[PDB]
From Swiss-Prot:
GO cellular component term of the entry, any: bacterial-type flagellum
Induction trigger: Inhibited in nutrient-poor medium (at protein level).
Gene expressing this chain: fliC
Organism whose genome encodes this protein: Salmonella typhimurium (strain LT2 / SGSC1412 / ATCC 700720)
Function: Flagellin is the subunit protein which polymerizes to form the filaments of bacterial flagella.
Keyword Secreted attributed: yes
Gene Ontology molecular function: any one: receptor ligand activity
Subcellular location: Secreted; Bacterial flagellum
Other comment: Individual Salmonella serotypes usually alternate between the production of 2 antigenic forms of flagella, termed phase 1 and phase 2, each specified by separate structural genes, fliC and fljB.
Keyword Lipid biosynthesis: no
Protein name: Flagellin
Protein keywords: Bacterial flagellum, Secreted
Predominant cellular place of this UniProt entry's protein: secreted
Family, as annotated: Belongs to the bacterial flagellin family.
Length: 395
């Protein structure tokens, strides 16, 4: 029978295929590393502005991310050839233990030691107060039942509010159309006091007669709920408390100054102590701290707040566990299915060209090793072929 020897040859060709697959992937990782090296040589041109460095860093980050994708996705018959350290044993002979081994290695940004390769420089960070304006409505529904017992001093038979309360975002005062049944000259506009907790509505200031001139011209909003000033940073403040943040919060406008004295404006931020949390101002004028949304850590869905830090002082970072990653990386990430990781780059990498060449050398010996194993498989295939040919041409 020849079929057992041809199966071994078949296995041997799979061994070549998996080595060639790994080799094509490493040639790609190598290209990405050479580009990263060009960028590193470019970044060392001191005439570069910080904005130039940020741009070069973005492309270095793209290159490193691609390397990580290649490492994670490259496969042969499902075998993720560069996602983990593993020795693959391939039966190329007729009997037990007669195999050729392919030592596969996990090759990625981290194992290559370039996971925090950074060429950026810190900007001088500063801010200026940005006064938040307008109001937003809460969950507190305006309870009007309590009005008629607070307006007994108007008299008559019955005092009832006609319709919805009119709010005034210029003063924060609420007003009411009031029909006083039985009264003489008591119908008109009244200012009402609103319980900012449960929403109760009561005649304000023990008014004994309607406002002179009726409803103020600034009282144009018809509210069904208690208004809260966007300046109280209701949600932002609750998020800061739940995060364990102690200081008083304030909304500021960020500014960043490079080494040449040039400053650009940043976005809005919620300043707390010395820390800055990137924020966004919503439709209604309210403000919310940026969050990133991620899976697990030690099991389950969670959330962290985006602070402004990183290697440049303006990168959205995030603290999970006892670490601080970039938010870009941390978004949609699973630390259960994929733990172990480097935080965000903290400073500029010392001797980056040395580090990139060491990564280029790692990739290269692996490639030389794989080419050597292909050679071993070719030798097996030849001997299997000579045996089978002899049997085929005979009997």
């Amino acid at each position: 029978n020849i079929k057992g020897l041809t199966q071994a040859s078949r296995n041997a060709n799979d061994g070549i295929s998996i080595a060639q697959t790994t080799e094509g992937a490493l040639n790609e990782i190598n290209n990405n590393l050479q580009r990263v090296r060009e960028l590193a040589v470019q970044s060392a041109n001191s005439t570069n502005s910080q904005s130039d460095l940020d741009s070069i860093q973005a492309e270095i980050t793209q290159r490193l991310n691609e390397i990580d994708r290649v490492s994670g996705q490259t496969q042969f018959n499902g075998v993720k050839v560069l996602a983990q350290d593993n020795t693959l044993t391939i039966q190329v002979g007729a009997n037990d233990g007669e195999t050729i081994d392919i030592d596969l290695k996990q090759i990625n940004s981290q194992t290559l030691g370039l996971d925090t390769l950074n060429v950026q420089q810190k900007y001088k960070v500063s801010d200026t107060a940005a006064t938040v304006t307008g109001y937003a409505d809460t969950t507190i529904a305006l309870d009007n039942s309590t009005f008629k017992a607070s307006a007994t001093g108007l008299g008559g038979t019955d005092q009832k509010i006609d319709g919805d309360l009119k709010f005034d975002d210029t003063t924060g005062k609420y007003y009411a159309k009031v029909t006083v049944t039985g009264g003489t000259g008591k119908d008109g506009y009244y200012e009402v006091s609103v319980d900012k907790t449960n929403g109760e509505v009561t005649l304000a200031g023990g008014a004994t007669s309607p406002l002179t001139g009726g409803l103020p011209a600034t009282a144009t909003e018809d509210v069904k709920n208690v208004q809260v000033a966007n300046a109280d940073l209701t949600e932002a403040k609750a998020a800061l408390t739940a995060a364990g943040v102690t200081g008083t919060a304030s909304v500021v406008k960020m500014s960043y100054t490079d080494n040449n004295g040039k400053t650009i404006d940043g976005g809005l931020a919620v300043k707390v102590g010395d820390d800055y949390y990137s924020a966004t101002q919503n439709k209604d004028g309210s403000i919310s701290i940026n969050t990133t949304k991620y899976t697990a850590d030690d099991g389950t869905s969670k959330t962290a707040l985006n602070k402004l830090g990183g290697a440049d002082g303006k990168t959205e970072v995030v603290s999970i566990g006892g670490k601080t990653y970039a938010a870009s990386k941390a978004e949609g990430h699973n630390f259960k299915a994929q733990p172990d990781l480097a935080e965000a780059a903290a400073t500029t990498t010392e001797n980056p060209l040395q580090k990139i060449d060491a990564a280029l050398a790692q990739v290269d010996t692996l490639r030389s090793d794989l080419a050597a194993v292909q050679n071993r498989f070719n030798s097996a295939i030849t001997n299997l072929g000579n045996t089978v040919n002899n049997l085929t041409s005979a009997r």
